[PDB]
Amino acid sequence: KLRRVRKSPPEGWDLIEPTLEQFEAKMREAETEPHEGKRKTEINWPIFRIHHQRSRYVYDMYYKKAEISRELYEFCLTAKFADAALIAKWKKQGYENLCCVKCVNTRDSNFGTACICRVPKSKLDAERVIECVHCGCHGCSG
C-alpha cells in the first residue's frame, strides 16, 4: 500500500499505523480462514466487516476525534486505507451507520428496493431479527 502512494505518510502516521497494521492482520486472516462449516453467504461477511471497521477508524480519527490532520486523513483515502465512497455515505444524514455500499445499491435488488437492513427498526415488526445476505448487518439505519 504505502509503496503505491509515492509520498511519505505526512503527519502523525505513528498515531494510526499500529491500528491500521492490526486491521491488515485481521483482513488477511479473514481471507485465508476455511470456508467450511459456513453458509455460502457467510464467508464474505468478515471482509465487509473489517473493511467497515478500518474505514470507520480513519473516519473517526479525522472527523469525530480530530486527532489526525486533513493531509494525513486524505493520505489514507489516497492509500486506500479507507473507502472514500463509504465515508462519503457516512457524511449523509440517515446513512451515518451504513455497513457497506452494496446495501444501498437499489439497482442490484430484484424489486429495486434498498437492503432490508436499511429499514429503520421502528418500521419493522420490531421483534423480527435480520441478517442481510450482503454482510450480515442486523440493521444500520435507526
Partner RNA sequence: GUUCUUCCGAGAACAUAUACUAAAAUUGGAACAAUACAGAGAAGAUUAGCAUGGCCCCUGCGCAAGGAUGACACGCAAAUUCGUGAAGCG
Which of positions 45-104 make contact with Zn ion (CB under 5 A)?
A: 99-100, 103
| Cβ–Cβ < 8 Å for 123, 99 | no
| Cβ–Cβ < 8 Å for 68, 92 | no
Using left for φ > 0, alpha for ψ between -120 and 50, and beta otherwise, residue 91 falls in alpha
Identify what 137 binds: Zn ion, RNA, none; CB under 5 to 8 Å per kind.
Zn ion
Which of positions 4-43 make contact with RNA (CB under 7 A)?
A: 36-41
140 touches Zn ion by CB under 5 A: yes
Per-residue binding string, Zn ion, 102-121, x by CB under 5 A, is: -x-----------x-x----
Minimum gap (Å) between residue 105 Cβ and RNA: 10
* Contact range with RNA by CB under 7 A, out of 10-18, 52-60, 79-87, 127-135: 127-135
The Cα 17–Cα 65 span in angstroms is 16
For cell 421502528, what's the residue? 122
**DSSP letter (8 states) at residue 33:** S
| Cβ–Cβ < 8 Å for 62, 70 | yes
For cell 491488515, what's the residue? 24
101 touches RNA by CB under 7 A: no
Residues of the shown chain interacting with RNA in the complex, contacts defined by CB under 7 A = 36-41, 92-97, 104, 106, 108-111, 113-116, 118-120, 122-125, 130, 132-134, 141-142
